[PDB]
Amino acid sequence: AKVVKFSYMWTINNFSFCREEMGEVIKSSTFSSGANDKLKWCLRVNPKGLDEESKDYLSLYLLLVSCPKSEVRAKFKFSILNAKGEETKAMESQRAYRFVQGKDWGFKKFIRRDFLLDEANGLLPDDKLTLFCEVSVVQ
Amino acid sequence: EKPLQVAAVDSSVPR
């Protein structure tokens, strides 16, 4: 199995200005590996959760935005950058998931929002949420 | 009360 590792850091500025609706989606800019294979990825966040059951959480997904092949398998890992600059609260997929164009995989309940908004945890310094994604794609 | 994070992986489909 041939594997390409790559990563993306996303800073969401003005986090408290997100819309107060569970529908709302925010997406990152697209990013890619160096393998030069026409794959484009982005991150997707539901700041107020995906749906009623998850409304207390922030949801976080990896989306394969563009891919001219039938499928690609990839492992992934998300983390939050704290006010010290270190990664915290990471979660990984453990195994590789099958992506096709337009498909996303991730965590409906990535982190409870009240924890996020709790000043003492230092995860929204300056009203900014910084997320780090590591991806390992099978080539 | 509720877990801080749930490591269950799924695909963005609202319920």
Residue numbers in the entry:
A (entry chain A): 27 to 165
B (entry chain B): 126 to 140
What does the paper say about this structure?
The adaptor protein, speckle-type BTB/POZ protein (SPOP), recruits substrates to the cullin-3-subclass of E3 ligase for selective protein ubiquitylation. SPOP recruits substrates via its N-terminal MATH domain, whereas a central BTB domain mediates dimerization and interactions with Cul3. Here, we show that MyD88 interacts with SPOP through a long degron that contains the established SPOP-binding consensus and an N-terminal site that we name the Q-motif. We determine the structural basis of these interactions and show that the Q-motif interacts with an unexplored binding pocket on the SPOP MATH domain.
To understand the structural basis of the MyD88-SPOP interaction, we solved a 1.9 Å crystal structure of SPOPMATH in complex with a MyD88 peptide, 125AEKPLQVAAVDSSVPRT141. In total, 15 residues of the 17-mer peptide were well resolved, with only Ala125 and Thr141 missing, most likely due to flexibility of these terminal regions. The MyD88 peptide binds in a groove on the surface of SPOPMATH, making extensive contacts and burying ~827 Å2 of surface area. The SBC residues interact at an edge β-strand in a manner observed in other SPOP substrates, whereas the interactions of residues located N- and C-terminal to the SBC are unique to MyD88. The side chain of MyD88 Val134 is buried in a hydrophobic pocket that is contributed by SPOP residues Phe102, Tyr123, Trp131, and Phe133, whereas the side chains of MyD88 residues 135DSS137 are involved in hydrogen bonding with the side chains of SPOP residues Tyr87, Lys129, and Asp130. MyD88 Val138 cannot make these contacts, and instead, the backbone NH group of MyD88 Arg140 forms a hydrogen bond with the side chain of SPOP Asp77, thereby directing the C-terminus of the MyD88 peptide in a different direction from that observed in other SPOP substrates. The N-terminal residues of the MyD88 peptide (127KPLQV131) form both hydrophobic- and hydrogen-bond interactions within the substrate-binding groove. The side chains of MyD88 Leu129 and Gln130 sit in a hydrophobic pocket that is contributed by SPOP residues Phe136, Ile137, and Phe141, with the side chain of Gln130 also forming hydrogen bonds with the backbone carbonyl groups of SPOP Lys115 and Phe136. This binding mode is stabilized by backbone–backbone interactions between MyD88 Leu129 and SPOP Arg138 and between MyD88 Val131 and SPOP Lys135. The side chain of SPOP Tyr83 is involved in anchoring the peptide in this region, where it forms a hydrogen bond with the backbone carbonyl group of MyD88 Pro128 and contributes hydrophobic interactions with MyD88 Pro128 and Val131.
